Amino acid sequence: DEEILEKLRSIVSVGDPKKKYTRFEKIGQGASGTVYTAMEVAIKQMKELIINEILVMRENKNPNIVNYLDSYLELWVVMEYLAGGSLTDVVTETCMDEGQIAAVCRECLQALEFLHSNQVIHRNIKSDNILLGMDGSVKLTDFGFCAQIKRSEMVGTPYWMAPEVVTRKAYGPKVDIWSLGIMAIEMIEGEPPYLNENPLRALYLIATNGTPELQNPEKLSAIFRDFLNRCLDMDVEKRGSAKELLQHQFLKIAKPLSSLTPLIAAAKEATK
């Protein structure tokens, strides 16, 4: 209703975006809207959720969060451009080693530590929401499902949701730790657990089986298996916080972020 639209209109910038930005080039299509490149920036063209998202993004700037630049009123959102694409492209088309996985996990944990200390829960951590820079920069985006703080809304993407979310229990920031654990499984196996199943049967599987099992756990080092176990603990109090996990031994084997640029080149070659 008009009252929420007025609040949204008071938040967006005024002036012609067609006059501030040039060289529009379409680079994608999805559920939300159409993504363009301009001058380098990335512009997504598409109620109370759009307000929460713009507000949370302006208020929570961090080097491990894609920079929100501007918005215009149908609704255009201007972000920094990360030319290396998404982590999804890398996870589905390449074999990442433990040093590369640890580098990505560390970057994601730094973004989560920042968010959780600012009482923000992302609730939609997945490889699709991780953007890569041409230098190997790792950044988090899509704050549409975020909540400012316990919660009990069944919010997220089925395959990456924590059991306490799926079962509609009072939950906290550690739901993002579980989702990161699922994203580390994506990095290992190419997919989150139960992707072959329909989203509802995955929800039942998360609620009944709990901690998912790896297809080949013997292939992982002892320190990596432990890191995953701390991410995917059933008991929320036992599950590690972002601050605690930043000190885990697994992150000490992290390779420089430059080690990710051959993966970006491989993903770009596979998806052409």
Ligand X SMILES: O=C(c1cc(CO)ccc1Cl)c1c[nH]c2ncc(-c3cnn(C4CCNCC4)c3)cc12
Binding site for ligand X (CB under 6 A): 27-28, 32, 35, 42-44, 66, 77, 79, 81-82, 85-86, 131, 141-142, 144
Across 19-43, b (16+ Cβ under 10 Å) vs e yields: eebeeeeeeeeeeebebbbbeebbb
CB of 86 to ligand X, least distance (A): 6
Distance from C-alpha of 186 to C-alpha of 81, rounded to nearest angstrom: 24
Taking the least distance from each CB to ligand X, the nearer of 28 and 212 is 28
3-state secondary structure of 36: strand
Provide the minimum distance between the beta carbon of 127 and ligand X in the complex, in angstroms, as a whole number.
Answer: 12
> Beta-strand (E) ranges in the chain?
25-29, 34-38, 41-45, 68-72, 76-80, 120-121, 130-132, 138-140, 147-148
For residues 264 and 84, is the Cβ–Cβ distance under 8 A? yes
Q: Which is nearer to ligand X, 144 or 212 (CB)?
A: 144
Q: How far apart are CA 167 and CA 169, in angstroms?
A: 6
First to last CA, the chain: 43
CB of 75 to ligand X, least distance (A): 10
Minimal distance, residue 64 CB to ligand X, in Å: 14
Helix (H, G, I), strand (E, B) or coil at 40: coil
User: Which of 88, 111, 91, 114 lies closest to 101, judged by CA?
Assistant: 91
Q: What does the alpha-carbon distance between residue 111 and residue 91 come to, in Å, rounded to a whole number?
A: 20
SS3 of residue 27 by DSSP: strand
